[PDB]
């Protein structure tokens, strides 16, 4: 469950002294139920990634309240936020944010090391995750040695490896063809059905937005989606 409450966010850029504000989000309110796939669509540059970065605590809102699973996460320090992310969050990054010095296997395995599961019990988990995203043969590759869609699926696999309660997916199928994207969407829907994982998916694709139980439109920094219908 995500409860974004009247979130305003702005950015400050420019040389010191001549700093200008970049109003990104204005009074953004987003409620995602537990085990629901919320899809956030909007024009490029509307603040969708900013919204996900606020939900995950990558940035702190200029004002507003983010409540995840009932706990106010605004005001978390880096340690509190990192523990919360390890416990509850998987994040699929728009630029896939893979560690260059690790292979595909080591990248997907890193969350399991951070949770300290078992190096022996990690093998089966990472192998199955890589097979689910069609990357069995690329486990030895580095992100240097991957396609954009393969790096995207490494990001997907790293986010889904821990089976978190919330997955924040930042355009998780933009680098994928229709078949690979359909496989990833089927995996997302399977995780949502079976593990009850809450998904917040930014997407520019109509099919990906259609898999969601909720649709939210980001326009002019306003989340005027408010869509919640039965399935």
Partner 1 sequence: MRFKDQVHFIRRNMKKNRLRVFMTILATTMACAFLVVLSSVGFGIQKTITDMTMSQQIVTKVSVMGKEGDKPIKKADLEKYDHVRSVVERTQVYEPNKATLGNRTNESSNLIFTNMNDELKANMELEKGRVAKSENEIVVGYDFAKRLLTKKESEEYNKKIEEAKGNPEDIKEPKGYTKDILNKTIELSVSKTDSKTGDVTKTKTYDFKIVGITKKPSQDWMEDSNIFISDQFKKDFSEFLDFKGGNVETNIGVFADKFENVEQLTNDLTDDGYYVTSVTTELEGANTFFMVFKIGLIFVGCIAVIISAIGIFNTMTMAVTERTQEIGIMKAIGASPSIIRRMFLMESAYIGILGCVIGIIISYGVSYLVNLAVPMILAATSGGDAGDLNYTFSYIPASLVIIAVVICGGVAVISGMNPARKATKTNVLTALRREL
Known binding site for ATP: residues?
A: 42-49
Q: How far, in Å, CA of 93 to CA of 175, rounded?
A: 12
Q: Does 107 bind Mg ion (CB under 5 A)?
A: no
Shorter beta-carbon distance to ligand VO4: residue 71 or 95: 95
Instruction: Give the contact letters, 107-146, x = binds to ligand VO4 (CB under 6 A), - = no.
Output: ----------------------------------------
CA dist 207 to 122, 132, 159, 174, 176, Å? Answer: 33, 20, 21, 12, 13
Contacts of 62 (CB under 8 A, 6+ apart): 8, 9, 10
The residue count for the chain: 231
Q: Which of Mg ion, its own copies, partner 1, none does residue 9 bind (CB under 5 to 8 Å by kind)?
A: none
Q: How far, in Å, CA of 53 to CA of 33, rounded?
A: 19
Q: Which of partner 1, its own copies, ligand VO4, none does residue 20 bind (CB under 5 to 8 Å by kind)?
A: its own copies
CB of 92 to its own copies, least distance (A): 13
Q: Which of partner 1, Mg ion, its own copies, none does residue 6 bind (CB under 5 to 8 Å by kind)?
A: none
Shorter beta-carbon distance to ligand VO4: residue 148 or 196: 148
Q: How far, in Å, CA of 32 to CA of 27, rounded?
A: 16
Q: How far, in Å, CA of 39 to CA of 43, rounded?
A: 13
Contacts of 174 (CB under 8 A, 6+ apart): 94, 152, 203, 204, 205
Q: How far, in Å, CA of 191 to CA of 47, rounded?
A: 27
Residues in touch with its own copies (CB under 8 A)? 11, 13-14, 20, 22, 41-45, 49, 94-95, 134, 138, 140-142, 145-150, 152-153, 171, 174-181, 204, 206
Residues in touch with partner 1 (CB under 8 A)? 13, 53, 56-60, 78-79, 81-83, 85-87, 89, 91, 93, 97-103, 106, 110-111, 113-116, 119, 142, 144-145, 158
């Amino acid at each position: 469950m995500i409860d974004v409450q009247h979130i305003d966010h702005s950015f400050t850029i420019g040389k010191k002294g001549r700093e200008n504000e970049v109003p990104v989000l204005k009074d953004v309110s987003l409620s995602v139920a537990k085990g629901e796939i919320a899809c956030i669509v909007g024009r490029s540059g509307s603040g969708k990634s900013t919204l996900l970065n606020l939900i995950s605590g990558y940035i702190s809102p200029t004002k507003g309240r983010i409540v995840i699973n009932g706990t106010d996460v605004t005001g978390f320090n880096e340690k509190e936020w990192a523990q919360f992310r390890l416990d509850h969050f998987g994040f699929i990054f728009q630029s896939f944010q893979l560690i260059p010095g690790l292979t595909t296997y080591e990248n997907v395995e890193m969350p399991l090391a951070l949770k300290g599961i078992k190096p022996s019990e990690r093998k089966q988990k990472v192998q199955d995750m890589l097979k689910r995203v069609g990357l069995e043969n690329h486990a030895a590759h580095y992100p240097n040695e991957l396609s954009g869609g393969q790096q995207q699926r490494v990001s997907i696999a790293r986010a889904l490896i821990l089976n978190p309660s919330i997955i924040l997916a930042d355009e998780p199928t933009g680098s994928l063809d229709s078949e690979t994207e359909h496989e990833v969407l089927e995996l997302i829907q399977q995780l949502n059905r079976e593990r009850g994982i809450t998904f917040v998916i930014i997407t520019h694709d109509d099919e990906v937005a259609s898999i969601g139980h909720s649709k939210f439109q980001l326009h002019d920094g306003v989340l005027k989606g408010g869509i919640t219908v039965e399935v």
